[PDB]
Structure formats: structure tokens, C-alpha cells
């Protein structure tokens, strides 16, 4: 019943504008999910 392999998955950070693709050891559940730290992009006004 064990199916949940961790995989070296690529991802993109929506906070960036250059579309640079990085990599991360994500789970098998949140594949393609938004970058969680993307909230830390509130540049000064």
C-alpha cells in the first residue's frame, strides 16, 4: 500500500518574472504545486 516516492522534481517560482526553473526533492502529492515561499515577495513600496 506504500506508494509515495520522493522525486527530484523541477519547479518554477511564480514570484520571479524570468521563468527560471529550479529543482527540489518534492513529494508525490504536491507535484506542480505553487512555490510555498512565493509569499515572500512584498518588495518595498
Amino acid at each position: 500500500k506504500k506508494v509515495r516516492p520522493w522525486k527530484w522534481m523541477p519547479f518554477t517560482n511564480p514570484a520571479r518574472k524570468d521563468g527560471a526553473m529550479f529543482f527540489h526533492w518534492r513529494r508525490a502529492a504536491e507535484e506542480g504545486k505553487d512555490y510555498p515561499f512565493a509569499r515572500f515577495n512584498k518588495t518595498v513600496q
Binding site: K1, K2, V3, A29
Partner: protein
């Protein structure tokens, strides 16, 4: 304008506006042993890819409330998005209340509703009173009705006559859907191993395979005779969340009578429970409880004062809730009340065709009663009277 009808309990928290949001939204929070102990809310359970071993944080474990924190968190998470469109003073809410609930807890709930969420109006209508109003609107020729609300965590025999409920022939029974689910859990645990404490899959198995036996001792004999002949030994394959995410009763043809399959599932299952766990509602006290069934109280509730209500009471029996979902429940209740009540007095028992959200239907139908503005208590009235106007209005 629109209104928000809310019914609340241990298993379900059904909120709905004038047109949509008709579903079985739960009331408790779920914690997954695997998802880093994340605390999920009523509808966020769908985000959990593995509901095995979910720890339930319950605002109600039985008819009464506990740990406001959970209820307020659930309400906030519901309102925060499409469910209710958090706008507060634009519309009003109508909340149900148990038959005999904590006076202090309920008045404090009304206080919180007026203060924090500041609904322009809310009232103290009863869960049974709303169903009574629904039934009266359905049958205007009726003048008296008894509601048998066998909810997932409730069993209320509530009379209603002349648009007023009397607090003498009003019965509640602790044999609820939660008790049935826990008993099925304990039985499966004891008969397959010495310990098993999962809840989410067995709660589904309950509504999937269980049924009310029309002939209890006949089914018992059919189960006592070897499985080669019985028909109630339908096997149920449990979900593993890796090949099939939802359990299911295997077809009668695919059943391998040896009880073992080369596929490797936890299909193990027995026949007795299927019809033994629901009959606790009808013939309790077999396990040890001093709790009484459905029919003897349906009877007791009628013969108090009026010979003019008694006949209308027998004629108007409204079976509702969640425990009335098993097949044969209606027929069994009808046969029992027909054999228990006098012959001369007519006895008509009719369960609706879609009583899955009967409370929401009653609310959506009362939304245009042209008297809700009087039935309800408003912000200023509450602030000025101090729970007195709320105690007056229901």
C-alpha cells in the same frame, strides 16, 4: 435578500444559502498522522490524499457542544470563501438548536453570533421545529405531527401541535449513528484482530453495506447456517488509496467464498454486522444499555393528553435524519408502529423521497415566509435586551 440556514451537530455542519451549497459538509476538524499533523477543516478533508487514521477534533461528541474554538474555526473557514461570501451585515443567519441544549452555551453562541460575525438578525428556532414547519407547509391539512429525527448523532421523538411543542412527551435516545459506527468498528476489530481503531472507512462501510432486516431472526438463522447458502455475506473491499481510493461491495458473482483473494486486499468481512448494527436502533438493550428503541417511544409520545391529537399523531409520523438512510428502515418503523398502535386509529408513515438535506429544504422554503423579519431577533434588539428578546423568540 438571501439568508443562511445552519444546522450543526457532531458529524455534520450543514450551512446553505437561499439557492445552493447543498452538501454534507462536516463539523469536525481532521488531523492526518502522515501530513505533518496538519489540522484540516470541514471541507479541506478532500485535500487529504490519505484519510487513513484521521484524528477527529469534534466540537460535539454528542448532542451538546464542546470546545468553542473548533466551531468558531470551522465557521471562519467556511465563511472565508465561496461558501458564504463573508459579507456580514448584508444578510442574516438562522441557526438550529438541540431539543434541550445548554441554555448558557446557546445564549453565549447567540452572543458571539451577534458580536463577532454581527449578523443583522438571528433566531433561536429548533432543529425539530424547522422540520415541523416544513412538514406543515407540505401538508396544510394536518394539525399535529411527530418527528422521529434519527440523525447521525441524534435520536429525537419530538411532538408538534397547534404550532407549539410541549416539553413533557419529548424523548431523546443516545443510540445514534456515531454509536452504530463505533459498534461496527469494535465488532470488526474484535472479530478480525484484538485491536483496530480506524473510523473514516468504517463510517462509509456503514452506509454502504448495512441494512435494516425486516425479519431479524430469519436473517440470524440465514447467517448461522453455512455461507454456502446465505445471501447476506456480501464482501466489502476496503480502500488502500493506492489502487482504489474508495471501498466498495464486491459483486455477488466475483465473491470468492474462501474469504481469501490473491489480490492482497483487506476485503475480510462478515455477514452478521451488516444487519446487526442497524437493529440497535429498534431493539436496543441487547448490548447492555438501558436505552429504548424507536417504536416504543414513538408510541409513548402519543398517549399523553389528547384523544384528538392521538389520531392525527398516528397519521402524521415524519421520519427524518441520517439513520433513516438504510433500506427497509421505513418499512420496519411502519410495521412496528402499526402493530403497536390501536387498530382503529390510522397510522401513516411516509419518509420523503430526498430527505438528505431536509433541514436545508425547510430553510430555503422559509426564506420567503414573509414573516421571518418578525420570527427573527435583530442586532439592536439583542444589544438592548441582553438575551431576553432571544429567550422570548424561541
Amino acid at each position: 435578500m438571501t439568508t443562511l440556514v445552519l444546522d450543526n451537530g457532531a458529524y455534520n455542519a450543514k450551512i446553505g444559502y437561499s439557492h445552493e451549497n447543498v452538501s454534507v459538509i462536516p463539523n469536525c476538524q481532521f488531523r492526518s498522522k502522515t501530513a505533518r499533523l496538519k489540522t484540516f477543516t470541514a471541507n479541506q478533508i478532500d485535500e487529504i490524499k490519505d484519510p487513513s487514521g484521521l484524528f477527529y477534533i469534534l466540537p460535539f461528541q454528542k448532542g451538546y457542544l464542546v470546545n468553542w474554538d473548533v466551531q468558531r474555526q470551522v465557521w471562519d473557514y467556511l465563511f472565508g470563501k465561496e461558501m458564504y461570501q463573508v459579507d456580514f451585515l448584508d444578510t442574516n443567519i438562522i441557526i438550529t438548536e438541540p431539543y434541550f441544549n445548554f441554555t448558557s452555551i446557546q445564549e453565549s453562541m447567540n452572543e458571539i453570533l451577534f458580536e463577532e460575525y454581527q449578523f443583522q438578525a438571528v433566531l433561536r428556532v429548533n432543529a425539530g421545529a424547522l422540520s415541523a414547519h416544513r412538514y406543515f407547509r407540505d401538508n396544510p391539512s394536518e394539525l399535529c405531527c411527530i418527528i422521529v429525527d434519527s440523525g447521525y448523532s441524534f435520536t429525537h421523538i419530538v411532538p408538534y401541535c397547534r404550532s407549539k411543542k410541549k416539553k413533557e412527551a419529548i424523548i431523546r435516545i443516545n443510540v445514534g449513528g456515531k454509536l452504530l459506527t463505533n459498534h461496527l468498528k469494535e465488532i470488526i476489530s474484535y472479530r478480525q484482530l484484538h485491536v483496530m481503531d480506524e473510523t473514516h472507512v468504517i463510517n462509509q462501510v456503514k452506509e454502504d453495506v448495512c441494512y435494516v432486516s425486516q425479519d431479524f431472526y430469519r436473517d440470524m438463522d440465514i447467517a448461522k447456517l453455512k455461507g454456502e447458502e446465505n445471501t447476506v455475506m456480501i464482501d466489502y473491499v476496503l480502500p488502500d488509496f493506492s489502487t482504489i481510493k474508495k471501498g466498495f461491495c464486491k459483486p455477488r458473482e466475483e465473491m470468492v467464498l474462501s474469504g481469501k483473494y490473491k489480490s492482497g486486499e483487506q476485503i475480510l468481512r462478515l455477514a452478521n454486522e451488516r444487519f446487526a448494527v442497524p437493529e440497535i436502533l429498534f431493539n436496543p438493550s441487547d448490548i447492555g444499555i438501558q436505552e429504548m428503541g424507536i417504536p416504543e417511544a414513538i408510541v409513548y409520545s402519543i398517549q399523553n393528553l389528547p384523544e384528538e391529537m392521538q389520531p392525527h399523531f398516528f397519521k402524521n409520523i415524519v421520519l427524518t435524519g441520517g439513520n433513516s438512510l438504510f433500506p427497509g428502515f421505513r418499512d420496519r418503523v411502519y410495521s412496528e408502529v402499526r402493530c403497536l398502535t390501536p387498530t382503529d386509529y390510522d397510522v401513516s408513515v411516509v419518509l420523503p423521497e430526498n430527505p438528505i438535506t431536509y433541514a436545508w429544504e425547510g430553510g430555503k422554503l422559509i426564506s420567503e415566509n414573509d414573516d421571518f423579519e418578525d420570527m427573527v431577533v435583530t442586532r439592536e434588539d439583542y444589544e438592548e435586551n441582553g438575551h431576553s428578546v432571544c429567550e422570548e423568540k424561541f
